[PDB]
Write an enzyme that holds these catalytic residues in place. Structure first.
Site, PDB file in Angstrom:
ATOM      1  N   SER A   1     -13.413 -26.464  -7.628  1.00 27.79           N
ATOM      2  CA  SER A   1     -12.918 -26.607  -6.126  1.00 27.79           C
ATOM      3  C   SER A   1     -11.390 -27.332  -6.334  1.00 27.79           C
ATOM      4  O   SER A   1     -11.522 -28.265  -6.617  1.00 27.79           O
ATOM      5  CB  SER A   1     -13.883 -26.785  -4.897  1.00 27.79           C
ATOM      6  OG  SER A   1     -13.298 -27.002  -4.044  1.00 27.79           O
TER       7      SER A   1
ATOM      8  N   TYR B   1     -18.138 -33.918  -0.671  1.00 28.85           N
ATOM      9  CA  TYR B   1     -17.973 -32.425  -1.001  1.00 28.85           C
ATOM     10  C   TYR B   1     -16.607 -32.724  -2.525  1.00 28.85           C
ATOM     11  O   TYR B   1     -17.164 -32.184  -3.234  1.00 28.85           O
ATOM     12  CB  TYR B   1     -17.373 -31.472  -0.504  1.00 28.85           C
ATOM     13  CG  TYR B   1     -17.309 -30.026  -0.976  1.00 28.85           C
ATOM     14  CD1 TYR B   1     -17.915 -29.120  -1.019  1.00 28.85           C
ATOM     15  CD2 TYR B   1     -16.270 -29.595  -1.282  1.00 28.85           C
ATOM     16  CE1 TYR B   1     -18.217 -27.178  -1.292  1.00 28.85           C
ATOM     17  CE2 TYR B   1     -15.559 -28.116  -1.501  1.00 28.85           C
ATOM     18  CZ  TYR B   1     -16.656 -27.685  -1.619  1.00 28.85           C
ATOM     19  OH  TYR B   1     -16.495 -26.368  -2.140  1.00 28.85           O
TER      20      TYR B   1
END
Ligand SMILES: NC(=O)c1ccc[n+]([C@@H]2O[C@H](COP(=O)([O-])OP(=O)(O)OC[C@H]3O[C@@H](n4cnc5c(N)ncnc54)[C@H](OP(=O)(O)O)[C@@H]3O)[C@@H](O)[C@H]2O)c1
Ligand SMILES: [Ca+2]
Length: 223
Positions: free
Chosen positions: A142, A156
């Site tokens: 990501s 995250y």
């Protein structure tokens, strides 16, 4: 004969586009989900292509791995691709972004278990079948792993940064067994944690087919 994909995180956007890409290419696609198999599922795959598993639960993961290995016997115990796209980013009270100050132990634990531990647990659990196929492992990373993002919390972000490093280590470890391991970082946050996604799915597919046979340890940053 048919090449087989095991995919986690078959959610709208990247996940569905990846299912579609591999299905149209003639692959068997085994999806992992917390949900029971339902006949109202978008793709026409039957229950034999669905694995109910909670990736936050190491016991359930072992049960899923053993079931996947049984279902791969129908193809000579070969797994041509494992794609780790599952990812969670729990929100604080009132739907707020959860930062480093406010994240409780239980969230750190579950986010790293789903986002980071499950990819390596699944890869080493399915090692024999990956090796037998000289298969490919793709970990979806990501942009949050490299820069602070308004829509992705700290657990995250840090677990995805850890996953990028794990990908590099896995490529070194799995390489001598003939299994390639690579990462792809989409140009935008995966809307699952809330055209561009078709490009991510196309690149995952590339990393699992003959043209990428010699590529390992890379991380592709979609721009
Ligand atoms: C809800 O919805 C929001 C997030 O958006 P969303 O619904 O798109 O996200 P999400 O469904 O909760 O998760 C994103 C993707 O990762 C998979 N995944 C996440 N945790 C998993 C686990 N423990 N075991 C197996 N697969 C797992 C999901 O599969 P499945 O959901 O099919 O298990 C889904 O494909 C949050 O508010 C959340 O509370
Ligand atoms: Ca061998």
């Amino acid at each position: 004969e048919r090449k087989t994909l095991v995919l986690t995180g078959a959610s709208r956007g990247i996940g569905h586009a990846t299912v579609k890409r591999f299905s149209l290419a003639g692959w068997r696609v085994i999806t992992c989900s917390r949900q029971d198999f339902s006949e109202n599922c978008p793709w026409p795959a039957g229950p034999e292509d669905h694995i109910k598993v909670d990736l936050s639960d190491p016991e359930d993961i072992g049960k899923a791995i053993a079931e996947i290995r049984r279902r791969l016997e129908a193809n000579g115990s070969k797994l041509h691709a494992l794609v780790n796209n599952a990812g969670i980013s729990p929100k604080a009270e009132g739907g707020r972004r959860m930062n480093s100050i406010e994240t409780p132990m239980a969230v750190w634990r579950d986010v790293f278990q789903v986002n980071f531990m499950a990819p390596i647990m699944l890869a080493r659990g399915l090692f024999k079948e990956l090796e037998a196929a000289q298969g490919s492992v793709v970990n979806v990373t990501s942009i949050a792993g490299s820069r602070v993002h308004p829509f992705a919390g700290t657990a995250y972000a840090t677990s995805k940064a850890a996953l990028a490093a794990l990908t590099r280590e896995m490529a070194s470890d799995f390489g001598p067994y003939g299994i390639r391991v690579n990462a792809i970082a989409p140009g935008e946050i995966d809307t699952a944690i809330l055209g561009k996604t078709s490009e991510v799915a196309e690149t995952i597919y590339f990393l699992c087919t003959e043209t990428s046979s010699y590529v390992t340890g890379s991380e592709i940053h979609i721009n």
